Design a protein around this ligand. Structure first.
Ligand SMILES: Cc1cc2nc3c(=O)[nH]c(=O)nc-3n(C[C@H](O)[C@H](O)[C@H](O)COP(=O)(O)OP(=O)(O)OC[C@H]3O[C@@H](n4cnc5c(N)ncnc54)[C@H](O)[C@@H]3O)c2cc1C
Length: 500
């Protein structure tokens, strides 16, 4: 664990997708690497003997330093309860800005701990439009495959999918989508589907078939600590320091960068502060975490020479959640896997460009609800800005900016409602139909080739690199983590061969 006064060759801030890629490639190149993570390592059993808590009866392990459990669905037939808990270094951070809540994973593995495991490669044509500076041949011939393979991506057995009661909700969602002319697609995942069959057979401990996902999975889900980070640790050159929040990065005297961090206990109390010197720093604190850091450092005069583009172009991957009421003959089932495997792909339609996951609502009883999380091609963006008064970084995103996304989603769902003669639910979230006040997919803030060079370097400060979701221009049209991993793979390849 890092100590005040230490000097290290390479320091990776954060341990999500970008961080895990940076750590693996650096250590394989033989460079001793330190990861600093603000959350805890999730490899120690809790009170009940399990590492993570489930969603039906969550405890303090659920939330990052909060007083109530939380998720988008709110108090709906027993699901999504807001129970009082003690402040603890739990796994899911519902980080509130003025116009949006940004859900983020905290701990060794970052968002991989809490996400739905959906591993989607973006459409080449859209990729080529939004990231024109990137050689797409390299991406599709090499980096995307490298990412999918490293992540442990696999596909569900389609025959098993058709027969199992656990995916009845997905079959119902497929049926009504197709009746209205919409294309559906299976979605690859890092959840071990062979393990899932055994869960269904009652031969192994249930996780995905046991009400677990958003506060972690005790089995089945291949989070980064089981893949990239395990491989990085196998080199013998990785050190992970947990419960340390990086608060400041500034040029050190002579060379390198002073990195200030707050050590916290498991209740979130700062117990000590340390400053270490690093020759190279890799920002992988996430779209929000890295943007807040760099926007603060620039505003407070620590890295005053950073680009004017730092803080610009944040987006929410057009996230909109909605639920529809099925008629009684279209039940969705009392047994629902927590891992989505199917989506509605309408991205090609210029008038309603959305890719919607058919999401489970694993309440354990028949609700007749079809739930969807839509990625819409919402052009709206926002920026982070340092608030002098408060000393905090604000996000200028306004909830009204989700209106364009709702209009796009509505074009698809209104058509299905018209065909099926159904209405939307208005009770899943305060009498609101559209879940438009949160995102699971923060993207941007430090755009590739705008705030950084074409490989994620901050050119004004040699030795500083950005390798995470802050690089992505606000929207990729699909679940983001594969893109973040593949971009990180591309960047590390170049940086290691060119700079190191
Ligand atoms: C509920 C939910 C469901 C999702 N489902 C999917 C899905 O199925 N598929 C998909 O593609 N995407 C999904 N996502 C999004 C995906 O998880 C993120 O896009 C991804 O994890 C971002 O990768 P990253 O490396 O940019 O950062 P993160 O994975 O967010 O990692 C950032 C890490 O840095 C740490 N950190 C932050 N600030 C500091 C600091 N100052 N000091 C030190 N450490 C710090 C954080 O604790 C965290 O561990 C989902 C997200 C959520 C919240």
């Amino acid at each position: 664990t890092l100590a005040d006064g230490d000097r290290v060759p390479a320091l990776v801030i954060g341990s999500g997708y970008g961080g895990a890629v940076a750590a693996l490639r650096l250590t394989q190149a033989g460079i001793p690497t330190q990861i600093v993570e603000m959350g805890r390592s999730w490899d120690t059993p809790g009170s009940d003997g399990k590492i993570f808590c489930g969603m039906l009866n969550p405890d303090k392990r659920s939330m990052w330093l909060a007083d109530k459990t939380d998720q988008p669905v709110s108090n709906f037939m027993g699901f999504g309860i807001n129970k009082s808990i003690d402040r603890y270094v739990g796994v899911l951070d519902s980080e509130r800005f003025s116009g949006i809540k940004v859900y983020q994973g905290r701990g060794v593995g970052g968002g991989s701990l809490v996400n739905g495991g959906m591993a989607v490669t973006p459409k080449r044509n859209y990729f080529e439009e939004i990231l024109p500076s990137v050689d797409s041949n390299e991406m599709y011939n090499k980096y995307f495959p490298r990412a999918n393979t490293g992540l442990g991506v696999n596909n569900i057995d389609q025959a098993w999918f058709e027969s199992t009661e656990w995916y009845k909700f997905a079959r119902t969602g497929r049926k009504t989508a197709q009746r209205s002319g919409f294309t559906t697609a299976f979605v690859p995942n890092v959840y071990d589907f062979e393990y899932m069959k055994k869960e269904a057979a009652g031969q192994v401990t249930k996780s995905g078939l046991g009400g677990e996902v958003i506060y972690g999975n005790n089995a089945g889900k291949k989070s980064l600590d089981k893949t990239y980070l395990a491989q990085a640790a196998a080199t013998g050159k990785l050190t992970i320091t947990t419960l340390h929040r990086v608060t400041k990065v500034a040029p050190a005297t002579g060379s390198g960068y002073s990195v200030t961090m707050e050590q916290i206990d498991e209740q979130g109390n700062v117990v000590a502060t340390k400053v270490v010197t690093a020759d190279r720093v890799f920002f992988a604190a996430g779209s929000v975490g890295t943007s807040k850091l760099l926007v603060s450092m620039k505003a407070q005069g620590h890295l005053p020479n950073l680009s004017s583009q730092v803080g610009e172009g944040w987006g929410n991957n057009g996230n909109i959640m909605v639920g529809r009421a099925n008629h009684m003959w279209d039940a969705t089932g009392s047994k629902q896997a927590t891992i989505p495997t199917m989506g509605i792909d309408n991205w090609a339609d210029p008038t309603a460009p959305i890719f919607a996951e058919i999401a489970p609502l694993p309440a354990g009883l028949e609700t007749y609800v079809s739930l969807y999380l839509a990625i819409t091609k919402n052009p709206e963006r926002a920026r982070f800005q340092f608030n002098s008064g408060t000393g905090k970084v604000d996000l200028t995103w306004a909830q009204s900016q989700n209106q364009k996304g709702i209009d796009m989603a509505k074009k698809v769902f209104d058509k299905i409602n018209q065909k099926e003669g159904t209405i939307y639910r208005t009770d899943l979230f305060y009498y609101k139909t559209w879940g438009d006040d949160f995102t699971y997919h923060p993207l941007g803030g430090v755009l590739l080739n705008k705030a950084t060079d074409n490989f994620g370097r901050l050119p004004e400060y040699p030795g500083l690199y950005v390798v995470d979701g802050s690089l992505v221009p606000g929207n990729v049209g699909v679940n983001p983590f594969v893109t973040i991993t593949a971009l990180a793979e591309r960047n590390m390849d170049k940086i290691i061969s060119s700079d190191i």
